[PDB]
């Protein structure tokens, strides 16, 4: 793990609060004193006490992966603590939490441009990840974190987010991430509505396979809805690349004049 993750000295780490239960144990908020003496807020993921050797492997393997990325829209790994206890992964702090929860608290309270800003950020981090040959496989609004300036960053802590072919025979590529991105794009313009709500999973699979798609969110610009449908092409070879998605979003930020055109599943 130490090839990509720095071993932090625990005396440099202060715990301030428990802010959630994660999968391998709790997540906390705290501060990290860097070698240069600067102090930053961090999120601190603790490995649960009484962990098995395997959960350790997996807990840290997440840090091996994260430590390979250095990008403004990917969660930054500050380091790990393994030569003392509890075992920790320390990451940059994101004040406004998961994106889906955050947007649900603020239904219809942002401008279309603010929302596109969030989406641009996500698209840019994914462009980087796919450039490194990484397929995320769990790209979803709940795995996107958003900081106090509304900057969104890909993270990773699922039928509704998965492409038909990935569901069908585990064909996971960057194009299946692009499918998931279109779902994220729906989640954002919907302010955190569950994709396909509570439909039986069997019917989510079946409906999408027959050509049905999520409907446009309320007041959704045509441009963003068409982008969702492009992301949701049945033929994975026909989906945009992340680089094209970023380019499209950069255009809509330049001219909100394009966004003026406004638009149960649709076939
Ligand atoms: N508020 C924050 O700043 C939080 C924060 N940074 N984390 C947190 C801790 C660990 C992760 N881990 C990862 O993102 N792992 C990971 C694994 C594979 C790939 C990638 C990626 F590179 F980005 F593709 C990341 C993600 C997020 C949280 N996990 C939480 C879990 C539950 C509740 C709140 C949480 N808050 C936070």
Swiss-Prot record:
Autophosphorylates upon activation by EFNA5. Dephosphorylated by PTPN1. The modification Phosphotyrosine is found at residue 93. Residues 13-253 form the Protein kinase domain. The active site is at residue 138. Residues 1-267 are cytoplasmic. Widely expressed. Highest level in placenta. Heterotetramer upon binding of the ligand. The heterotetramer is composed of an ephrin dimer and a receptor dimer. Oligomerization is probably required to induce biological responses. Forms a ternary EFNA5-EPHA3-ADAM10 complex mediating EFNA5 extracellular domain shedding by ADAM10 which regulates the EFNA5-EPHA3 complex internalization and function. Interacts with NCK1 (via SH2 domain); mediates EFNA5-EPHA3 signaling. Interacts (phosphorylated) with PTPN1; dephosphorylates EPHA3 and may regulate its trafficking and function. Receptor tyrosine kinase which binds promiscuously membrane-bound ephrin family ligands residing on adjacent cells, leading to contact-dependent bidirectional signaling into neighboring cells. The signaling pathway downstream of the receptor is referred to as forward signaling while the signaling pathway downstream of the ephrin ligand is referred to as reverse signaling. Highly promiscuous for ephrin-A ligands it binds preferentially EFNA5. Upon activation by EFNA5 regulates cell-cell adhesion, cytoskeletal organization and cell migration. Belongs to the protein kinase superfamily. Tyr protein kinase family. Ephrin receptor subfamily. This is Ephrin type-A receptor 3. It comes from Homo sapiens (Human). The gene is EPHA3.
